[PDB]
Write a protein that binds this ligand. Sequence first.
Ligand SMILES: CCCCCCCCCCCCCCCCCC(=O)OC[C@H](COP(=O)([O-])OCC(O)COP(=O)([O-])OC[C@@H](COC(=O)CCCCCCCCCCCCCCCCC)OC(=O)CCCCCCCCCCCCCCCCC)OC(=O)CCCCCCCCCCCCCCCCC
Ligand SMILES: CCCCCCCCCCCCCCCCCC(=O)OC[C@H](COP(=O)([O-])OCC(O)COP(=O)([O-])OC[C@@H](COC(=O)CCCCCCCCCCCCCCCCC)OC(=O)CCCCCCCCCCCCCCCCC)OC(=O)CCCCCCCCCCCCCCCCC
Ligand SMILES: CCCCCCCCCCCCCCCCC[C@@H](O)O[C@H](CO[C@H](O)CCCCCCCCCCCCCCC)COP(=O)(O)OCC[N+](C)(C)C
Ligand SMILES: CCCCCCCCCCCCCCCCC[C@@H](O)O[C@H](CO[C@H](O)CCCCCCCCCCCCCCC)COP(=O)(O)OCC[N+](C)(C)C
Ligand SMILES: CCCCCCCCCCCCCCCCC[C@@H](O)O[C@H](CO[C@H](O)CCCCCCCCCCCCCCC)COP(=O)(O)OCC[N+](C)(C)C
Ligand SMILES: Nc1ncnc2c1ncn2[C@@H]1O[C@H](COP(=O)(O)OP(=O)(O)O)[C@@H](O)[C@H]1O
Lengths: 122, 104, 49, 459, 98, 56, 347, 320
Amino acid sequence: MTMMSGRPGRVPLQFLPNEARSLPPPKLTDPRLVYMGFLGYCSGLIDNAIRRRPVVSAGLHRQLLYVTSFVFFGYYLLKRQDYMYALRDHDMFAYVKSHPEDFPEKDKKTYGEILEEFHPVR
Amino acid sequence: PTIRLQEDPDPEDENLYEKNPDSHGYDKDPIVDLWNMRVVFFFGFSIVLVLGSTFVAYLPDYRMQEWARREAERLVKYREANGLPLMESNCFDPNKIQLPEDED
Amino acid sequence: KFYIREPPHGSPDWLKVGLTLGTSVFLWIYLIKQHKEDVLEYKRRNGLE
Amino acid sequence: MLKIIIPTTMLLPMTWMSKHNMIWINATVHSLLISLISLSLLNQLGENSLNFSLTFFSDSLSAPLLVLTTWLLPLMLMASQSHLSKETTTRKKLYITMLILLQLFLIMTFTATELILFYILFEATLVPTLIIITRWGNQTERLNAGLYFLFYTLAGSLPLLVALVYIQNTTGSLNFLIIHYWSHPLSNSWSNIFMWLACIMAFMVKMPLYGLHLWLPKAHVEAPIAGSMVLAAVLLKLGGYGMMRITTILNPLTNYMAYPFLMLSMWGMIMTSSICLRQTDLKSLIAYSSVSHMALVIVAIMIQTPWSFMGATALMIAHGLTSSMLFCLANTNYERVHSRTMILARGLQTLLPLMATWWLVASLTNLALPPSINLIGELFIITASFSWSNITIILMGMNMMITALYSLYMLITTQRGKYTHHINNIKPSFTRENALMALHILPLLLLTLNPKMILGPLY
Amino acid sequence: MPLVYMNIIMAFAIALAGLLMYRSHLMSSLLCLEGMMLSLFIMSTLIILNTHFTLANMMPIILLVFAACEAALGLSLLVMVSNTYGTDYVQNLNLLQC
Amino acid sequence: NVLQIVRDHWVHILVPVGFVFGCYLDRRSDEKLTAFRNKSLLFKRELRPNEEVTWK
Amino acid sequence: MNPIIYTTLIMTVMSGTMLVMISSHWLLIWIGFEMNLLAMIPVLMKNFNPRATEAATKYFLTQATASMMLMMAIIINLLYSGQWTITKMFNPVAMTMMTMALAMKLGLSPFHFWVPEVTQGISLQAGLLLLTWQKLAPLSVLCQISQSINPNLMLTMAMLSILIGGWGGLNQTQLRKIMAYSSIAHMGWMTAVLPYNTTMTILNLLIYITMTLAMFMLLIHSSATTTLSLSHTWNKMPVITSLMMVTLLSMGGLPPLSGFMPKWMIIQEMTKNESIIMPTLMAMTALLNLYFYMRLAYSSSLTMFPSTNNMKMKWQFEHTKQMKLLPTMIVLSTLVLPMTPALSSLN
Amino acid sequence: LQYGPLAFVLGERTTRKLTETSKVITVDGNICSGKGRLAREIAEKLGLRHFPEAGIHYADSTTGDGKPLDVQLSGNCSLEKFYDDPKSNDGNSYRLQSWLYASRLLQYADALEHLLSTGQGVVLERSIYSDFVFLEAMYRQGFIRKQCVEHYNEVKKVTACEYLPPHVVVYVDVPVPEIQSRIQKKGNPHEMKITAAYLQDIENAYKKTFLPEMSEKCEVLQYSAREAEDAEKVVEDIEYLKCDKGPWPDQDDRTFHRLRMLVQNKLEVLNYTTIPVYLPEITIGAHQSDRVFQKFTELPGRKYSPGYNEDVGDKWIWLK
Ligand SMILES: CCCCCCCCCCCCCCCCCC(=O)OC[C@H](COP(=O)([O-])OCC(O)COP(=O)([O-])OC[C@@H](COC(=O)CCCCCCCCCCCCCCCCC)OC(=O)CCCCCCCCCCCCCCCCC)OC(=O)CCCCCCCCCCCCCCCCC
Ligand SMILES: CCCCCCCCCCCCCCCCCC(=O)OC[C@H](COP(=O)([O-])OCC(O)COP(=O)([O-])OC[C@@H](COC(=O)CCCCCCCCCCCCCCCCC)OC(=O)CCCCCCCCCCCCCCCCC)OC(=O)CCCCCCCCCCCCCCCCC
Ligand SMILES: CCCCCCCCCCCCCCCCC[C@@H](O)O[C@H](CO[C@H](O)CCCCCCCCCCCCCCC)COP(=O)(O)OCC[N+](C)(C)C
Ligand SMILES: CCCCCCCCCCCCCCCCC[C@@H](O)O[C@H](CO[C@H](O)CCCCCCCCCCCCCCC)COP(=O)(O)OCC[N+](C)(C)C
Ligand SMILES: CCCCCCCCCCCCCCCCC[C@@H](O)O[C@H](CO[C@H](O)CCCCCCCCCCCCCCC)COP(=O)(O)OCC[N+](C)(C)C
Ligand SMILES: Nc1ncnc2c1ncn2[C@@H]1O[C@H](COP(=O)(O)OP(=O)(O)O)[C@@H](O)[C@H]1O
């Protein structure tokens, strides 16, 4: 099963439709972006360790490029994920609005008139 | 060779008291040993234990025990003065409870 | 000290180092500019300011 | 509550950036400081919990456990630096990293507001423990122990995961507060019975329940001293905390689903107390003692009364402290004589008097002497069980005798009699070991002074 | 379906069973493979001719082309197997187990 | 001379700095849960002539 | 083999896979499969020896049979509906034959016997290619025809794949066979969720490919093909063995490692439909894969095995060829769970 | 740039550099014969690179600083104690033989790499094709077990088949009594204990196995004791050799590419020397292996990669 591949108006290989520009971009201080940078730093440290170089101090340009690349890709990944979830909620709400008979709002009943069975603990 | 493999012999255990008669059991280096003892004793007994127990003993009453006692005193005084029972078997007013119409 | 050439000499490979730093700075400034334009476009579309 | 979580994640690089001969000092000092910081969580309310954020919360049941964990980390550090002296710097840093990661996972587990997050952390705790056991254990059984420690857990926890996600597809939320407020009774159907079993079996195997406990002797015997400390004092309480949490959605099925587990708990408490009477291994005796005490805790949780919950919380705290002390006391003799047999080194009171005093206090606390918190928990559980059924006072009473016997047995075997003649390598007790014993035992009586801090939310 | 269609399906099934049941020679299995290809060609041609699908008339030819590749591939492999054992028997290909 | 002292004992500020950072992050988390500030039926209150918010 | 010829053959393999992935015509998908097989056969025999020739012959026979069943299914579909476009597969017999052919191509049980043999018979690089890149095309076709699948047959083959992968991998001392059985079990996991959600299939495939790439690159870096030759690596480079152990733990599905994310998600997806028993059995069975990963970790990282004297010479030399993508692959294999929701970008 | 497929795709071809003086030469001979002097004179006259006979510390001479390391961290075997106690119960004899074979394999790889990279010829003293004679001499005298011979044969079978045999083999014949006279007149107090049976076994192995099987690949130049000092005549005899019968003329560009990728990357060369066959003579326990490896990693220029050790004067580390 595939939910969103046949959605009308979908450009095949876009990765970021124009409608996505209507959403607030992720902040550059987003904790997910910080975690992506941490992943890049870990990749740099592992690169230093595998090559048998001083793990923390061997290559600063390489480590900085690692962090930069991870943050750079993670920014667009987060943008696409937020766009996809916004699309999901949009379609959900539109479907609920267009099918009132399938989502009725029944009368609210307070706890003073609902009969709940009591199970003693003894 | 009548042997199975090349291996080091199992070495004898080192006694920390031989090179340091007052060794505290923390490290082979006497200075690092002494300071490990000092930091353990200061931060375990002096800081955490006594000060933490003092802090816990004087924690403000967020469980509302004294407040509950005073509230109970007020309610007991009022209900005894006006002759009402000290407690009621119902904790909710029956006027706001709607029983089902038919029991048959 | 090393009996062999050790192609990585005392001086670092300046071309590779310069390319690495240049790529990193270009990526960072591109990201900042993209984030600024995304913020501006979002505010314009939703009309906050 | 990030004010506690972040300093541990900072303990990590501080350990990895320390000078080669200053790792232990820095780790111990900052772990003690973190324990002092975590002491502030004991200031609880009377109605609801401390809801710090959407992710983490603190309750009157989890705060003593967090304090115990943060207090146990420095004790492990002191207990570990003796037998790791010959290790390389990198492996020492790796060992400290495992300990710190275990503490971080436990801290996040005890405060998670979400049941799937609780599952993820409560399962993540396995990797550092397994690595510690199978890498720094001493004998060749350790490998097998690790396997016994792993699959026994996973076979119990993988069904739970399924049940958990099933619940989230029915109620829409696994947050503990919403789960508590929107609670509904469980009907009597086969599907509900198996859902109950899936929700219960993981925590019952982590207790461990009698019959499911075979992993525990292996894990607690082949582990290093810090591993045994953390396995006995904290990791066994994950099952109790999880059962106390998850039982809010299992009523009224528990009313009759507890019978096999109650029967197993009582009879196996008697059985393990009896097993302690014939034990040639001193560590195995302490492990089976832990099994008996946790059987009592299982009974308390299963009968589902306020007094039982209070007694269970007190018993978990007291057992953690007491069992950690007993393991350290046994490890001192092991490090002296390199053997775990109880009748090898005898008459040690003559050679080590202060150690004999520590042994006496630990054994007196193990047999629940009044007014220790061990006794408070045991007596509350026994009163609750008596209210549940008057006949239980037989079995419980039986246990009370047997415990005392084996407890004093251990003491009389190790401290009294005459010293073994051919053992001449028993050096005077180091200041480190005496400080370890004192830091184990003083909090016990200090909590005896103020017992409402460990009585849980039902107080 | 007419009887000719089912006859072609039966030929395909017979060739498939012949490939799946090896006797000794790899060449016989290769011949069964070519028989499968021939049956597929005949059936596709019959279906395309019956429905007057003009642009699909090129499809069988392409099929034959790739058949040749497979045939060539198989023959090449056979050569190497022979060079290792002096025979094309499939019982000699047993160096790897499960 | 403080160069060697610093390069040897600079690892002693990581944990206190983490403590302060955790306190700051706890405050930042607190500032995002103010949807019911001074709005509960039990604690709803009139503002003082000077104060702006009942709690931070 | 000439480097230019080798590059041409590799590019032809990838071109066949892309032709399968970008086509709407059944004939073009079949042509892509044919081209992929034709270019793949020489790649398996890059290092010439009888074992490589046997592996190539077995692979060719299996894939040619599968492709003939594929073409027959296409022709039956054309007969009962004059359509060439890859769609809901208007005929049921043709769909059964298509499912069988694609399962044979992927190595799903009971068409699994060729996978361990071919993996053991070829070099580590060829095994890497076969176990990572060769799964994309049949899985892409299966994703495209997922709405018309018979859930009973697909789920039976997936469950059989998981069971057989665990049981077969329990008995291996050769690393390539262990990898092949792990691959079979992971294909079972990928195909179990295919009738319910193809996004979960893609996520599982991506995580499996990352973990397999990391494992194979670590095995190439430390030139070990058996358990005992891998047990020597701790005395030459312990960092590699530590990373290998953490990668094995991730492959075992333990939290909080990223290898836990696919199964977890699949379980949740299978619980959104009713499907309660099957995920429970599936996790119970994946415990076997975890067991033999743990045994490998015991043999290579958590204990020190005896070494040889000549290893001292190896201490004096460094690794000459350097794989640029190994650290990123390891990090993605391990520390990726907190970024789980990003899977929304897949659909 | 490092040699690889990219250099082969555009430009680099090995066949063009071969200029009739490639001619891998080995000068074999029994113990204490003047094969070394003849090798140096041949290399000087023909302008080839001379490789001194690979010893216990040959691998040390090519990595880091060329100075040898401690015997505990390199070799873990002694020739002197092999002479003193050839039947020692600690496995010294076969450990020495295996380490020497590994060193000879490394030296042959280095020589082939130099020849294929520069086109200049090389002259070796002994080779991997000649080492086995010493092993045979160890077996007939009871110095090593038969399992050691089986292990040696396995390693040699998996290793020596990947290279090309030398173009021309020079052998120098000295009778055993003259060898004993030379040993007596030498003065090294450990070689006085070499019994005549050992040297006779070495010569028997040489003349009965090595020369016959080597003559099938290419012709062999044999010289008596007196006709080896005249190096000019030996060189002029070498020069007029018709070398068109061995595997060397049958080598094209792609085979040379494969061999050149093999000769560099010394780890791939030494791959099969440490196969997991557990002979007591060469198997080392986990504790000793760990201790010795920790000892090795603490050497001044060994903790990190060649250009990353600041304790031997490596600068600009944080930008490399
Ligand atoms: C959850 C919360 C967050 C946590 C995240 C997860 C954990 C952290 C991230 C993990 C990845 C990061 C590092 C990976 C690369 C490291 C590789 C390595 O080899 O390290 C050696 C290296 C030492 O090498 P060296 O210095 O060059 O010289 C010594 C020689 O090399 C001598 O070295 P040697 O090679 O000769 O020694 C041999 C040794 C070499 O083997 C190793 O070193 C083991 C390393 C395993 C790599 C981990 C795999 C990938 C990551 C997955 C982790 C999973 C975590 C999930 C939980 C499960 C637990 C496993 O092998 C053994 O001894 C075998 C023992 C078997 C032990 C079994 C356990 C192994 C796996 C355990 C992994 C646990 C997590 C990582 C722990 C930290 C590792 C450094 O360690 C380091 O120095 C780096 C660590 C510190 C760097 C960060 C410093 C930060 C800067 C300070 C300021 C802080 C900023 C704060 C901001 C606020 C302003 C003030
Ligand atoms: C060396 C150790 C080795 C290792 C062992 C292990 C040790 C582990 C330790 C770990 C750390 C522990 C920390 C725990 C913290 C706890 C502190 C705390 O919460 O304080 C609570 C409590 C203070 O209560 P509070 O709530 O703070 O005060 C509330 C009022 O506002 C106040 O009322 P007020 O307005 O009337 O003012 C009273 C004020 C002033 O009142 C007066 O001055 C009047 C006193 C009456 C005398 C009047 C006549 C005498 C003079 C007449 C002649 C001179 C005048 C005329 C001059 C001419 C001469 C004729 O005096 C006080 O405030 C009480 C003294 C404060 C003591 C605090 C304890 C801190 C402990 C933390 C350090 C722990 C380490 C030990 C170090 C401590 C030093 C060794 O401290 C007490 O202990 C009170 C006990 C005294 C009551 C009498 C005992 C009754 C016995 C009945 C039972 C009989 C049965 C047999 C049992 C016998 C057992 C005794
Ligand atoms: C173990 C970690 C797994 C990581 C997997 C690889 C990560 C690095 C690869 C980088 C991807 C580069 C692609 C960017 C170029 C643009 C191409 C774009 O056009 O592709 C779109 C597609 O975009 C991609 O799907 C997004 C790729 C992002 C994958 C990462 C998510 C992994 C799960 C979360 C784990 C955390 C990952 C951390 C990242 C470093 C087209 O969509 P569409 O043609 O309509 O879909 C075809 C398939 N359908 C119709 C059947 C659905
Ligand atoms: C070596 C020889 C020793 C023998 C000689 C010793 C000499 C005498 C010293 C012994 C003292 C005797 C004890 C007598 C009791 C007096 C103390 C008591 O009064 O203080 C209690 C206070 O006790 C504290 O509350 C208990 C201390 C808290 C324990 C925390 C331990 C520190 C944390 C370390 C980590 C914990 C790990 C375990 C996890 C939970 C009062 O409780 P409370 O009724 O309220 O007070 C009412 C008035 N207030 C509220 C205004 C203060
Ligand atoms: C080694 C220690 C491991 C831990 C042990 C865990 C203990 C698990 C035991 C499970 C507790 C009870 C399970 C089911 C509840 C009732 C059991 C049954 O005997 O009661 C009757 C059940 O009747 C019959 O017994 C039918 C069940 C018979 C088949 C069950 C197999 C029992 C064989 C025991 C094998 C041992 C299991 C443990 C394996 C390790 C009640 O009649 P009924 O009203 O109709 O059923 C109630 C459910 N309704 C309301 C939906 C209808
Ligand atoms: N493969 C070997 N096994 C044992 N000993 C060897 C081996 N190769 C060389 N040696 C020893 O090295 C010593 C010197 O080697 P050699 O070449 O014969 O003399 P020279 O250096 O004067 O030319 C001799 O004592 C010889 O025994």
